[PDB]
Amino acid sequence: MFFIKDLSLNITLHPSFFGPRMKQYLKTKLLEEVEGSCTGKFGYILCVLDYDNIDIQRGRILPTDGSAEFNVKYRAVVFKPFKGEVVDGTVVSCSQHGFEVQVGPMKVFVTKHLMPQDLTFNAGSNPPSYQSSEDVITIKSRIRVKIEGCISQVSSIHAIGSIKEDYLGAI
Template sequence: MPPRRLGIVVVGLQARHKPSCLTLAAMFFIKELTHTILLHPSYFGPRMLNFLESKLYADVEGTCSGQFGYIIAVVSILDIGKGMVLSGSGQAEFITRYRAIVFKPFKGEVVDGVVSNVNKMGFFADVGPLQVFVSHQLIHPDLKFDSNSNPPSFASADQIIEKSTHVRLKIVGTRVDATEIFAIGTIKEDHLGVL
């Protein structure tokens, strides 16, 4: 299988090498991970390795692990272990080691996002795979909710926040579940808000 090209460009950042983690930016990391693949006996054969590789990509890319964050892309497969046949089912279990780009937000980081939903309580912004909620209490007091506008928006004399608006916000808190990350942000500080 030819190597896959990733549509990722990192400009002006210096990477620092760590034993199992390469830092691309404050919230993007290259991390060594493992994944267990169960393979049905019908896939045993000459193309088994290709199937294991494509199954690894399908299983892990785009998923979220509370411990490591969102797995954006598999960069390389380091090792596909020897399969162990499970008694009773005939399936083989393969433990694979791979290197992946992961996205994990941290408190205090400033990020750019696109507003996806606005209501009187605040708005939601999508920052890649992460959805950030900005409460009306963490929005600058000049921006007032306009319930009569269509679509709903927060507006001031010179700015308007509505669906599809690009905003810069600061993450003030995160909550990590087993399969999802939740974040709360603010645009109440200097240099934050509509881009």
């Protein structure tokens, strides 16, 4: 959850790409991997900082192959949700089972059984929405919900949350 840490990445380069610009090319391949990466082990990688200060270790030459393996260590900021935390997001879609909330690079789902009794789904408005005795929820709304479970995908992270404690919901 917004943590800065050092990550080591091993990059293989063909010996043909050995000119002075190779560094830049290598950096490009770094920009095509860290961005959009989502691994359960390290969570979701948010950004990489200090591009000009990136230090690359001496490349490793395979015993027989001509490829060069460079181990680059870089400081990067990553995001990873944890159970019991509360985060705010925006409703992206509505469904009978509930409404999905986009928060950061991730999605959150709220179980119907864990919803306020007053809150009730209604299809009389286009698009369908939810009506509460003291709150209003629509597609364009900032909703703060507590995350109770996390699911890790190959390249995605899903959260399961609920709104039962006070001060939750629309704000």
